[PDB]
Every structure is written in C-alpha cells, then in structure tokens.
Amino acid sequence: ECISVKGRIYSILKQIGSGGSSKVFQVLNEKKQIYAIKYVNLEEADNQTLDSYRNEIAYLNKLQQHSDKIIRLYDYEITDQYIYMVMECGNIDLNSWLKKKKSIDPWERKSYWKNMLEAVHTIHQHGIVHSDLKPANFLIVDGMLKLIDFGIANQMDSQVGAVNYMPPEAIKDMISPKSDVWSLGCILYYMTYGKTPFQQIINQISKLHAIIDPNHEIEFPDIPEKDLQDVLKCCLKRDPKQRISIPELLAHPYVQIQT
C-alpha cells in the first residue's frame, strides 16, 4: 500500500522496475486483480520531455484497439507533478527471459516472432518507427510477447548499451520502417543462434565499422529450419531497399507454413 489513480485505490505488492525517476509497481486493485502501475516524476521534465511523454501516452491509448500484442493500458492519472498508468501486468521481459533460458523451443520462437511482427506492424501503420528495438522492449504476458513502448518518450547503472541492434544506415547517416526490421532480425538471430550478429566484436568502434562494412560477411550457420535461415538473411541486408518489409515477413512461410 498504497497508490490512488482516478479514485480507485491500488496496493503495492512490489516494485518490478526502478528509475529514473520511473518506477513500475506490481499492484492489486480493490478486488485483488493484478496490474502494473508506472509512476513517473515530472518535477524535472522540460517541455519537450513532457510533450514526448504526452505523445506516447496518446498513441498507446489509441493503438489499444488495433492489437492485443500492444500492452493494455486500462486507465491513467496525469498532473503537472506526476503520471500514474494502470497497466496489464506481465511475467518477465524478453531480455531477462532470454538471458536465463538455456535455449528456446523452436515452436516458442516462431510464436514470439509472430507477436513481435504484429505489434511492430501496428505502430508502423500509424507512422511510428520505434528505431531502438531490443528484447528489453518486449513483455511476456500469458506466454505471449507484447510491445511495452513505442520509443517516443524515452529520451530521459552502466555502460549499457544495445549497440548490437543498431542498423547500419543509422551509422552511415551521421525513418524508416526498415530500421525496425533490422533490429527485429537481430532479436531473432539471438533467439536462433544464441548471440547477436556482431556480439563477439567487444570493441565499440570496431563493432560499428563491422555493421556498416559490406565486405564483412554476417554468418548464418546451417539449421533445420531453412525458413528461419532465410528470414534472418532477409532482415539483415545492409541496403534497406533490399531489406524485407514487415508485410513481406507476414507472408513468409516461416510465420505461415505450419510448421
């Protein structure tokens, strides 16, 4: 105990996430149903930050209706000092799950992949490119991946990280939906081969040079699922024009042909 969002009282079971100042609490309503409550402190947010927070809240609220692979947002209270967001509660985030799991069941992987496509497809269909997709951005809810954020709000402890998932065209350019495809392709590559394509290059500068270098051959060890191979090869094509799109991925035999 205790939080109060728009009249209704919620008792704090424990803190799932910390920050930030951004704290996600596992909580229970008056009828002991389980929710998550994200608490944000606005007392040091400037006007762009605030607007970005407002913008993402608006979209998450709208895109509720369009897919159930987008995390449910049930209600929220929002003042000048804080934000409270009553949300669907989840088992574990994908990054923590992957880290702990020894190796994924081939059926489980393909199923998660469909979830990831459905959610990312939805945000694209409203002009939203995430542009920073990591396993951390996905939540396992009832054995099912859901996208937690759209990457709008978050422009506000290591030494971390996630340069592994960075597409080459973001580096050469120093928009667009193909950037998200690359990043999803790295999440799958990880679920397939246990590491990200360039994970073993532990030097940062070297890593990026490797990502943008066309002569650097990305490895794709032979595996039973030749479908999976092909999907991985298509998402990790350095020329975004050549890269496969989400609609093409949704018509791919990997997610259609059974199984």
Ligand SMILES: O=C1c2ccccc2-c2n[nH]c3cccc1c23
């Ligand atoms: O970050 C998490 C999170 C992290 C670990 C475990 C559960 C959750 C979780 N469950 N519901 C929500 C809503 C928003 C964010 C998050 C959740």
